[PDB]
Design a protein around this ligand. Structure first.
Ligand SMILES: Cc1ccc(CNC(=O)C2CCC2)cn1
Length: 182
C-alpha cells in the first residue's frame, strides 16, 4: 500500500523460502549464497524441507552473544542448487530502535501476509519461553502462532526475525551485519 510494504514484498518474493522441521513450518530468510536464518526453537537437524523439497543441512549454528546468552537465531547453510540474492547490505550494523516496521510471513497457513507493526523498541533482555534471550526487538501487535521466522523490515533495512509474543506484544531477534561476514 506504501513504500514500507513495497520494501517488504521485495524481500519476501526473492529472499524467503518455506522451511519445515519436526517443530512446524517457518518463514525462512535467505541472506546470501546458500545461507539462511530461522528461529533456534525450529530445532534444525541434518535434513530440512525447503518449499517441500528434502534438503541436506551442510551447517547449522545457534548464535549466542559473548555473555553466552541465547540470541534465538540459527544460521543454516542449505545443500540447495540455487543462491539467494545477497541482501547483507540491508542489515543494520548496530543495535537500534526503529519507526514504522512491517512483519512479513509466508507459509501454507499464512501466504503473502504483511502486518504494519509500527514502532520497534530495542527491548534487550527477554525471558523467552523460559530461556534468557538478548538483542530482542519489541512491537505492540498481538502476533500469533504461525508468524515465527517472519521478517521484520523498515524502508531500506531488514532488522529482525519474529521469535515470539505474549498475546499483546511481539518479539523479534535482531539481525546484525556482523553475523554474516565471510
Ligand atoms: C516485489 C518487488 C521487487 C523489487 C522491488 C524493488 N526494491 C527492492 O528490490 C528492495 C531493495 C531490497 C528490496 C520492489 N518490489
Amino acid at each position: 500500500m506504501g513504500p514500507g510494504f513495497d520494501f517488504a514484498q521485495a524481500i519476501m518474493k526473492k529472499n524467503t523460502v518455506i522451511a519445515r522441521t519436526e517443530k512446524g513450518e517457518f518463514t525462512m530468510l535467505g541472506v546470501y549464497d546458500r545461507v539462511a536464518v530461522i528461529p533456534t526453537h525450529a530445532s534444525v537437524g541434518e535434513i530440512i524441507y525447503i518449499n517441500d523439497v528434502e534438503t541436506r543441512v551442510l551447517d547449522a549454528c545457534a548464535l549466542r552473544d559473548l555473555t553466552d546468552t541465547n540470541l534465538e537465531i540459527t544460521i543454516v547453510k542449505l545443500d540447495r542448487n540455487q543462491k539467494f540474492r545477497d541482501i547483507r547490505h540491508f542489515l543494520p550494523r548496530c543495535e537500534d530502535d526503529y519507526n514504522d516496521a512491517v512483519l512479513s510471513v509466508h507459509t501454507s497457513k499464512f501466504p503473502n501476509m504483511y502486518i504494519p507493526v509500527g514502532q520497534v523498541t530495542n527491548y534487550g533482555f527477554l525471558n523467552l519461553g523460559g530461556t534468557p534471550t538478548h538483542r530482542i526487538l519489541m512491537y505492540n501487535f498481538p502476533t500469533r502462532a504461525g508468524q515465527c521466522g517472519g521478517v521484520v523490515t523498515t524502508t531500506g533495512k531488514v532488522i529482525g526475525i519474529h521469535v515470539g509474543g505474549n498475546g499483546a506484544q511481539g518479539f523479534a531477534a535482531m539481525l546484525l551485519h556482523s553475523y554474516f561476514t565471510d
